[PDB]
Amino acid sequence: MPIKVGINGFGRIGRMVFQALCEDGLLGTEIDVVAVVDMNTDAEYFAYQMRYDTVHGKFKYEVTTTKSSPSVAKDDTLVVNGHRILCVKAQRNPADLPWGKLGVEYVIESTGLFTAKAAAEGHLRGGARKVVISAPASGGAKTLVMGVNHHEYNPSEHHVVSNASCTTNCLAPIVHVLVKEGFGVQTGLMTTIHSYTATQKTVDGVSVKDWRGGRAAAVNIIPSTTGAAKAVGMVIPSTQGKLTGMSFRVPTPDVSVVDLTFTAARDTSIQEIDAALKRASKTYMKGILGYTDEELVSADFINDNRSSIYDSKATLQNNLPKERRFFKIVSWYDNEWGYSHRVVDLVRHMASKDRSARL
Amino acid sequence: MPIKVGINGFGRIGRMVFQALCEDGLLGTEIDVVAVVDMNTDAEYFAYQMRYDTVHGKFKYEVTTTKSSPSVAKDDTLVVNGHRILCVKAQRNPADLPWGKLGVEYVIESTGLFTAKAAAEGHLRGGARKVVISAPASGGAKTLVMGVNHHEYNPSEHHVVSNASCTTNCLAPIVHVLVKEGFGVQTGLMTTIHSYTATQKTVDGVSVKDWRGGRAAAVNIIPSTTGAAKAVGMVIPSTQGKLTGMSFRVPTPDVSVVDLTFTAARDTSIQEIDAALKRASKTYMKGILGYTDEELVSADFINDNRSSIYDSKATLQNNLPKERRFFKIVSWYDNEWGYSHRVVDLVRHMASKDRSARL
Amino acid sequence: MPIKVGINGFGRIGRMVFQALCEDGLLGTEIDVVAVVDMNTDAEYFAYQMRYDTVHGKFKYEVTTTKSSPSVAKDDTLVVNGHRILCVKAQRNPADLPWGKLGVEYVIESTGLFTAKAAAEGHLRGGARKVVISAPASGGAKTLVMGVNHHEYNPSEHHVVSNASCTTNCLAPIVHVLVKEGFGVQTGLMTTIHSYTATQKTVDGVSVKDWRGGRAAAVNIIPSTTGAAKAVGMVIPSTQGKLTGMSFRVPTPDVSVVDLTFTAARDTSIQEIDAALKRASKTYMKGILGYTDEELVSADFINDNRSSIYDSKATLQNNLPKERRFFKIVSWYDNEWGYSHRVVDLVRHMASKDRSARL
Amino acid sequence: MPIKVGINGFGRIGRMVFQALCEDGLLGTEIDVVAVVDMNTDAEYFAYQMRYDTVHGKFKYEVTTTKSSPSVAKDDTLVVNGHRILCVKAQRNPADLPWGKLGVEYVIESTGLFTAKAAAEGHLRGGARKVVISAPASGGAKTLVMGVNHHEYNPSEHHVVSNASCTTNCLAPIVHVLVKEGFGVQTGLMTTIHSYTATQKTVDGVSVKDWRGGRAAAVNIIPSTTGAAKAVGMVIPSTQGKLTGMSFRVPTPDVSVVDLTFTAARDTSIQEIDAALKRASKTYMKGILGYTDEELVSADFINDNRSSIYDSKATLQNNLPKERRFFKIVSWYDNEWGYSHRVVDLVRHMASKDRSARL
Ligand SMILES: NC(=O)c1ccc[n+]([C@@H]2O[C@H](COP(=O)([O-])OP(=O)(O)OC[C@H]3O[C@@H](n4cnc5c(N)ncnc54)[C@H](O)[C@@H]3O)[C@@H](O)[C@H]2O)c1
Ligand SMILES: NC(=O)c1ccc[n+]([C@@H]2O[C@H](COP(=O)([O-])OP(=O)(O)OC[C@H]3O[C@@H](n4cnc5c(N)ncnc54)[C@H](O)[C@@H]3O)[C@@H](O)[C@H]2O)c1
Ligand SMILES: NC(=O)c1ccc[n+]([C@@H]2O[C@H](COP(=O)([O-])OP(=O)(O)OC[C@H]3O[C@@H](n4cnc5c(N)ncnc54)[C@H](O)[C@@H]3O)[C@@H](O)[C@H]2O)c1
Ligand SMILES: *C(=O)C(=C)CCP(=O)(O)O
Ligand SMILES: *C(=O)C(=C)CCP(=O)(O)O
Ligand SMILES: *C(=O)C(=C)CCP(=O)(O)O
């Protein structure tokens, strides 16, 4: 019994999540992506967008389009591995989405227009049973980070949840190892050298909610506030109020890195931390936290499925010698790729626990 | 008193058109910028946007703000060395703007939303007497290129006109010299290696009307159709149907280059052509057509106010020796700066003609 | 039966050629890269340079290192998928290389510092027999272009050949089709919007031989002269003195595009030419000349091993309607990748016309 | 009378120093560049590089060229705004330079190859009474940072000094105010988001002594160690062993920013720290340390001559609320412009103390 899934908003964020799901080999097997709602319904265009990608290369599977019924001008259905995905048109209120009629049980909310728990809940009225906001959320939606606290998902209590942000999914795994291994965190500050994104502008333009963010993205280092570090406190309560940080948007299309500076809760050493991080990578954090000890640069992390990738050499080479509390930890993350898989990983976990709850 | 002007759409062109005004010592004497309209009326933001430009440097003149009336919450007025500009709130429809209440006789239309003559005439209903669309128009609006056919402005017939595009303003001057000097243009094709603009995207995004135009701007050479070359047959009638061309959007925030290939109407040489352009540059095309014979690159043309800078060295070193018909002409232009000065020149020319006609 | 090859100058093209050779699965079966010579001998550093590529992704095969003999300090042997390559030291003079000791006949010259057929001939008196210059050659060295004139190879007359340039390899196939098809070419000028290369500078720097080429590469559009067009005349004598052109280095790491403007030797149509290029691609030019009809941009050609990919839409949409002589043809090419595969395709041709023609 | 100066190594930094020297209007009156020795003699080329800059705009002073004496073959003299500057040929040893013959007492060592105190000594044997190394130096050379410890310059003891690096000139002022204002530094880690430099490469190349540094510069976030932090321990001894940090080279041609994270020596608040830095920039750090409180990005610091420009908004908005020990401070710098002005400043300072010590 495959999972009936619907993706609300088939923008750049939605596609990656769908491509993620495909590469893992879940389409038509584990997950039945029934539909994808969006303001556009030209499947031929959606096929072109999946087929090519400036940063992630060419799609692994062939993509064809077709009509849902002979009585349709331009194709309105996506085809991948014989799996048919219907392209539905956007709706003002999520409650008006044909979710029930479509049989969609799990809807991936990625429009960025419904990050408020209450709003995202509309999908439920529209017939959905569970929603995953593919970004930070307000209103009190349960926030879950794979590999950190996803086992806290409660089928009967959590119907609208958030998979947090791509940056939190990079930082949290590092902090989670520190708090779980006993190094602990007294206070911390994080900085993320972040690739520019879709909200930024090519040339200087109007951006009322963030003036710096309206400046030419590919030719500027653009400072920015962020809530990713504070959010780690929701996934790991013991760090609430002890962490925060910023972001520097730099001229790269994809891939970012985490620069965490913190004071451990007890004497330790950078080598001791290096070992703990590596060890966790091969054990309880496998698939979520990985590491590298080669001379890598941002391009070498394009398409890496891990949420966080510890940079051993950079860490070990840039810490105070013989220091026991004040440390720096560098960890990479393909902001688009890692997160997209986490979103899929989370839907499968939820489905799994919802399933075992009806026995 | 000075010409009362209003700027609808304070973006790249609106602001650079303004810089041109201040720079040339026209503000308060020849031209009076009564107001500027954009998404908000928050002068502080307008000031910040004018004060700093990532490609054209810091505004050399001091900009401050004030309120039009204490009954106002936030400052809504810009002050540039004692000159006051009211920040009017954007209107979906031009006819709604308070041009009348402001005494605006000339309005620069630079939002990129009302390039249709019919839509632009909304400003006249608002109390404006003339309008210059800072882009190619449709609906039968007269098109004018300073240095080429601007003396075709008919005070009592043309009320809503178009100052063409940046590319046409770079091309036309060249073709005009070719036709006037008697070399002639039998057939021609041009390619413009163009800098990205506000219409493009930072990361692969949605662009139903121009699929290629939706791909990441600063990491792709993006082909694109353009009417710039065809529009020349609308300014230089004898070229109608003989020219056209394409564009290649590349990773630079500003400055572009026209690469024109053509067959002359008679036997010549690239040397004779070189001489003529240089000559016109120093004479009847001065101010509009300039030239360089140095090893310059795009950044070297940032802030050049001519409409076309003939690149002599590049032209002379890349043509068929002894050829007498098939030629290539390379010419640069600061797509933002040059064109913005042209808009101002156009308004001033219209204001003098208008006075003459009312004698 | 495994041949014998030796790459001199293991840089971008050297590694791209070696990688190309592996991609086609020739490492061991048909080709056997005996050894490679470059700057240092740090086998560890070579492998790292092979594992990761900023634009071409991560290498397909697994790479590791060992020692040719315990007698040597650091490693000096690559173990790509099993094969064993030796990192012989590089000499300032090609003659000083021990190609005889290792017995290497076919030596890929990719250092980019030995163009003269005399200097790049030292490989012969150094032990090697046949030498291939991965770049335009001088001193009268036979120039060959797969799909165009590579059959003009004389086993006993040609011992130091050239594979031409990336650009020549992209332009030639188009010209070839045009000529061979009967359209013919009276005159033609070509412009290539080209990505920056290793010879350029990250920031404005010294470059006596080419001032423009000395300016900041990733932020400027830089003009340059090129021989590519004239070079075609050497490969298709029918066009000698009929073609020339220039380049424009733009802010992209790889992938370029040719923009050819020409007058046919007879009356035709852009449609009749479009059809022939497509036909030639599927037939006698397959593998050398490809084509697309989708909304592609530079990034979409990354890793395309065709020498020239004709852009049907960019072409059919940008030519003069009803024209029959003056035309514009657009064709792409991964300057690093395509040329690399051609180098292998050539080295293999220079072998099949030896073991089947004299053995 | 005017300070007779010489600039060994007229590379980019050598040029920036000269332009800065001119920008301060010191050329001819308060300092005269007798000559500028470099590996190249092509004065015309010198005039070209000085005339245009892809990031700093066009030179505000006219530069022409002539011969020192009709007997001289090519032009060997640069004529700047009137002042005459000779282009001497480079030597293998400073002592071989005509410094004394020319009457050059202060030589600006910026060839980057005479870093060693002993090496840089040769200039003294040649006649020069003082040498300033425009970069970190070794061999027991006095390191001086304007506004921080330049008053530690000993006329008769320090004849060969270092002006440190761009980064140290940004961090030092910040730390200096922290220490001088009574906050103190217990421990500190610094991260600099740094724009690429001349030693990096356009495409993946060879960097035997820095694998990451060899990767494509304008398309990667490239990690890197740095001495700036530790180097501060020379200027401000109390911090020795307390500070260290790294670097992240990003896709920008110029302008960088320091991200400092530290623990104060006493309890404070970010407000208190913020107020102090501002007060200091307005007083004893005037000209060296500046601050901003506007929404600025990298482009806005281009041509800023301060050594460090504190970012108040970014600092205040990104620190732990109510924190009293663990803080983060953000400060910008035009790694090319600021440092170039400091160099000039150091020479002017020395020249001053040297004379007052013998009056
Ligand atoms: N930038 C160039 O190189 C260039 C050169 C020549 C001509 N043009 C033309 O100028 C026009 C504007 O181009 P741009 O580069 O300045 O783009 P831009 O996006 O920078 O400027 C457009 C501005 O209009 C504002 N706006 C949007 N809707 C509005 C409304 N209803 N009322 C008032 N303001 C509104 C936007 O906030 C924006 O600031 C376009 O038509 C373009 O084709 C651009
Ligand atoms: N990359 C391209 O776009 C391209 C495409 C086709 C042909 N080519 C031609 O290939 C040649 C090299 O181009 P590239 O892009 O690979 O440049 P590159 O700089 O990346 O490669 C050249 C390599 O040779 C090494 N080298 C220098 N002197 C050497 C010596 N004496 N012995 C051994 N190695 C030495 C350099 O360290 C460098 O790694 C040039 O002739 C170029 O015209 C380049
Ligand atoms: N560019 C910056 O951001 C910057 C800022 C501050 C300090 N520095 C320091 O400056 C030095 C390099 O300056 P750059 O970054 O401007 O590099 P650059 O490559 O632009 O300058 C090097 C110049 O030195 C010339 N040169 C080399 N050896 C020479 C010799 N023997 N005689 C004469 N000329 C010679 C070269 O021709 C070249 O023009 C390094 O020590 C660097 O740490 C650089
Ligand atoms: C000049 O830059 C132009 C008018 C290009 C078209 P647009 O994208 O509208 O700026
Ligand atoms: C291939 O040969 C290239 C690296 C392009 C050289 P050019 O045609 O001069 O841009
Ligand atoms: C300032 O940018 C530095 C710390 C030195 C730059 P470079 O020596 O070119 O790496």
**Which residues, at least 6 apart from B278, have a Cβ–Cβ distance to it below 8 Å?**
B291, B310, B312
* Distance between A25 CA and the closest CA of chain B, angstroms: 24
Q: Is C27 left (phi over 0), alpha (psi -120 to 50) or beta?
A: beta
Q: Please tell me the total number of residues recorded for chain D in this structure.
A: 359
Mutate: best of A300, A305, A332, partner C, most C CBs <10 A: A300
Chains within contact range of chain D (3+ C-beta pairs < 8 Å): A, B, C
Question: In total, how many domains does chain D have?
Answer: 2
Closest CA to ligand 3's atom 27:
D111
Looking at residue C119, the DSSP 8-state letter turns out to be: G
Ligand 5 atom with the shortest distance to the CA of C197: 4
Pocket of ligand 5, beta carbon within 6 A: C 165-167, 192, 194, 197, 224, 226, 228, 247, 335
Q: What's the domain range around C250? A: 165-335
Residue D45 sits in the same domain as residue D139: yes
CB atoms within 10 A of CB C99: 28
Quote the CA–CA distance of B102 and B104 in Å, as a whole number: 6
* D355 marked ligand binding residue: no
* Distance between C239 CA and the closest CA of chain A, angstroms: 37
Collect all residues of chain D within an 8 Å Cβ-Cβ radius of residue B56. none
β-pairing, D3-8 vs D31-35, is parallel
A253 touches A53 (CB < 8 A)? no
Backbone angles phi, psi at C298, to 5 degrees: -30, -50
Residue A130 sits in the same domain as residue A179: no
* D212 marked ligand binding residue: no
* Greatest Cα-to-Cα distance within chain C, rounded to the nearest angstrom: 74
Residue D97 sits in the same domain as residue D46: yes
Q: Does A182 touch chain C (CB under 8 A)?
A: no
Q: Does A221 touch chain D (CB under 8 A)?
A: yes
Collect all residues of chain D within an 8 Å Cβ-Cβ radius of residue B53. 299
Residue B144 sits in the same domain as residue B104: yes
Q: Is the Cβ pair B300, D58 closer than 8 Å?
A: yes
Q: Please tell me the total number of residues recorded for chain C in this structure.
A: 359
Q: Please tell me the total number of residues recorded for chain A in this structure.
A: 359
Q: Does D296 touch chain B (CB under 8 A)?
A: yes
Measure CA B2 to chain center. 23
Q: Does A189 touch chain C (CB under 8 A)?
A: no
Our CA dihedral for A11, A15, A18, A24, rounded to 10 degrees, sits at: -150
Nearest partner of C147 among C332, C315, C283, judged by Cα = C283
Q: Is the Cβ pair C328, B220 closer than 8 Å?
A: no
**Which residues, at least 6 apart from C185, have a Cβ–Cβ distance to it below 8 Å?**
C175, C178, C179, C238, C239, C242, C243, C262, C263, C264, C265
Q: Is the Cβ pair A52, C296 closer than 8 Å?
A: yes
Q: Is the CB of D115 under 6 A from ligand 6?
A: no
**Which residues, at least 6 apart from D215, have a Cβ–Cβ distance to it below 8 Å?**
A297, A299, C52, C54, D201, D204, D222
Q: Is the Cβ pair B55, D219 closer than 8 Å?
A: no
Residue C242 sits in the same domain as residue C303: yes
Helices (H), chain D: 12-23, 43-51, 99-102, 122-125, 168-180, 228-235, 270-281, 312-316, 337-356
Residue B207 sits in the same domain as residue B260: yes
Q: Is the Cβ pair A202, B201 closer than 8 Å?
A: yes
Quote the CA–CA distance of D277 and C214 in Å, as a whole number: 40
Closest CA to ligand 5's atom 7:
C226
Q: Does D195 touch chain A (CB under 8 A)?
A: yes
Q: Is the CB of B225 under 6 A from ligand 4?
A: no
- Name the E strands within C16-159: 33-38, 65-66, 77-78, 85-89, 106-109, 131-133
CA of D38 to the centre of ligand 2 (A): 27
Nearest partner of B255 among D253, D302, C297, C222, judged by Cα = C222
A-contacting residues in D 323-352 (Cβ below 8 Å): 323, 325-328, 330
Backbone angles phi, psi at C273, to 5 degrees: -80, -40
Residue B315 sits in the same domain as residue B194: yes
Nearest partner of B48 among A247, A195, A213, judged by Cα = A213
* Distance between C48 CA and the closest CA of chain B, angstroms: 25
Q: Is the CB of B197 under 6 A from ligand 4?
A: yes
B350 touches B130 (CB < 8 A)? yes
* C317 marked ligand binding residue: no
D244 touches A318 (CB < 8 A)? yes
* Distance between D73 CA and the closest CA of chain C, angstroms: 18
B141 touches B160 (CB < 8 A)? yes
* D38 marked ligand binding residue: yes
Mutate: best of C56, C58, C293, C332, partner A, most A CBs <10 A: C58
Q: Is the Cβ pair C48, A299 closer than 8 Å?
A: no
Cβ burial of B111 (10 Å; 0-12, 13-18, 19+) is buried
Q: What angle do CA C5, C199, C299 make, to 5 degrees?
A: 80
Q: Is the Cβ pair C202, D220 closer than 8 Å?
A: no
Mutate: best of A45, A52, A65, partner C, most C CBs <10 A: A52
Which tokens sit at A162?
């958030």
Q: Identify residue C221 by its one-letter amino acid code.
A: I
CB atoms within 10 A of CB B46: 24
Q: Is B226 left (phi over 0), alpha (psi -120 to 50) or beta?
A: beta
* C318 marked ligand binding residue: no
CB atoms within 10 A of CB D47: 19
Computed over its alpha carbons, how large is the radius of gyration of chain D? 21
**Which residues, at least 6 apart from A335, have a Cβ–Cβ distance to it below 8 Å?**
A166, A167, A194, A195, A197, A254, A255, A256
Collect all residues of chain C within an 8 Å Cβ-Cβ radius of residue D201. 198, 202
Experimental technique for the deposited model: X-ray
Residue D236 sits in the same domain as residue D215: yes
User: Which residues of A are identified as catalytic?
Assistant: 166
Looking at residue C344, the DSSP 8-state letter turns out to be: H
CA of D195 to the centre of ligand 6 (A): 9
Residue A152 sits in the same domain as residue A170: no
**Which residues, at least 6 apart from A205, have a Cβ–Cβ distance to it below 8 Å?**
A214, B11, B12, B198
C290 touches C281 (CB < 8 A)? yes
User: Which residues of D are identified as catalytic?
Assistant: 166
Domain of B276, CATH number, reads 3.30.360.10
SS3 content of chain A, % helix, strand, coil (to 5): 30, 25, 40
Report how many Cβ contacts below 8 Å link chain B to chain D: 30
Collect all residues of chain A within an 8 Å Cβ-Cβ radius of residue B38. 206
* Distance between A293 CA and the closest CA of chain C, angstroms: 12
**Which of D52, D219, D300 comes nearest B300 by C-beta?**
D52
Q: Which residues pair with C27 in a beta bridge?
A: C31
Q: Does D219 touch chain B (CB under 8 A)?
A: yes
* A335 marked ligand binding residue: yes
Residue B118 sits in the same domain as residue B184: no
C198 three-class SS:
coil
Which tokens sit at B176?
């005009």
Residue D133 sits in the same domain as residue D29: yes
Residue D131 sits in the same domain as residue D81: yes
Q: How many CA atoms lie within 13 A of D21 on its CB side?
A: 28
Where chain B is discontinuous (C–N > 2.5 Å), the residues before each break are none
D-contacting residues in C 256-285 (Cβ below 8 Å): none
Domain of B64, CATH number, reads 3.40.50.720
